[PDB]
Amino acid sequence: GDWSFLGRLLENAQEHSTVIGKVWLTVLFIFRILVLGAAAEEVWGDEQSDFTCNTQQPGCENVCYDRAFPISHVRFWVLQIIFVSTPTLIYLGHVLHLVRMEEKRRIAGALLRTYVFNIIFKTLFEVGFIAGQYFLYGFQLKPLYRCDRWPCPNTVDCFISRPTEKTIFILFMLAVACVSLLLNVLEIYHLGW
């Protein structure tokens, strides 16, 4: 996808942010957005095309792929990026609003509360997506999925495309997410002390 606009806004955000925040935005751009576009989207491109079920039943592969993958991992990661970035956009907008207010007439007062809330929201959204992915997929895609959804007769064996590569990238993104959490914790403590 085209992340250009979000890029513009977040680049603006870098200036009005802590050094650790600039590190966080670098991580977001490089290890999350760029990995997803350059590497992961191609991994998941044949997810349903090369999903195969051992059966002659029409409609079984469709319902089985749908039950195994209610949302694709890459779409989940898109949404995670958007939601962890939204607080930064809120804070940046409040900052620009105060600048416009000054013109009509760095981090302190209302902006400090807003920045702390921004880090907080980023952390909660962060953790939330991590836990949701754990409960939806664990952290390993196995090659076999056994499916008993109508119209499949009895239980059918279905086979995943590229499960090991997908597992590698699942874990890569989990690690990047954990690094982001650590960075946000560092921001909180660094402001505190």
Ligand X SMILES: CCCCCCCCCCCCCC(=O)OC[C@H](COP(=O)([O-])OCC[N+](C)(C)C)OC(=O)CCCCCCCCCCCCC
> Which tokens hold the place of 16?
């009005």
| Ordered DSSP codes for 75-100 | HHHHHHHHHHHHHHHHHHHHHHHHHH
Residue 67 or 107 having the CB closest to a copy of itself: 67
Identity of residue 89: L
The two counts, helices (H) then strands (E), for the chain are 8, 3
State yes or no: residue 151 binds ligand X (CB under 6 A): no
Site string for a copy of itself, 122-151 (x = CB under 8 A): ---------------------xx------x
Cα distance between residue 131 and residue 147, in whole Å: 25
Site string for ligand X, 83-122 (x = CB under 6 A): x---------------------------------------
Helix, strand, or coil (residue 156)? strand
> Which tokens hold the place of 138?
């664990």
- Contact at 8 Å (CB) between 34 and 3? no
Between the CA of residue 159 and those of 63, 66, 108, 144, what are the distances in Å? 13, 13, 56, 5
Among 112, 132, 157, 182, binds a copy of itself (CB under 8 A): 157
State yes or no: residue 3 binds ligand X (CB under 6 A): no
CB of 101 to ligand X, least distance (A): 28
Q: Which among ligand X, a copy of itself, none contacts residue 136 (Cβ within 5 to 8 A by kind)?
A: ligand X
Q: Which among a copy of itself, ligand X, none contacts residue 72 (Cβ within 5 to 8 A by kind)?
A: a copy of itself
Interface residue list for ligand X (CB under 6 A): 68, 70-71, 79, 83, 125, 128-129, 132, 135-137, 164, 167-168, 171-172, 175-176
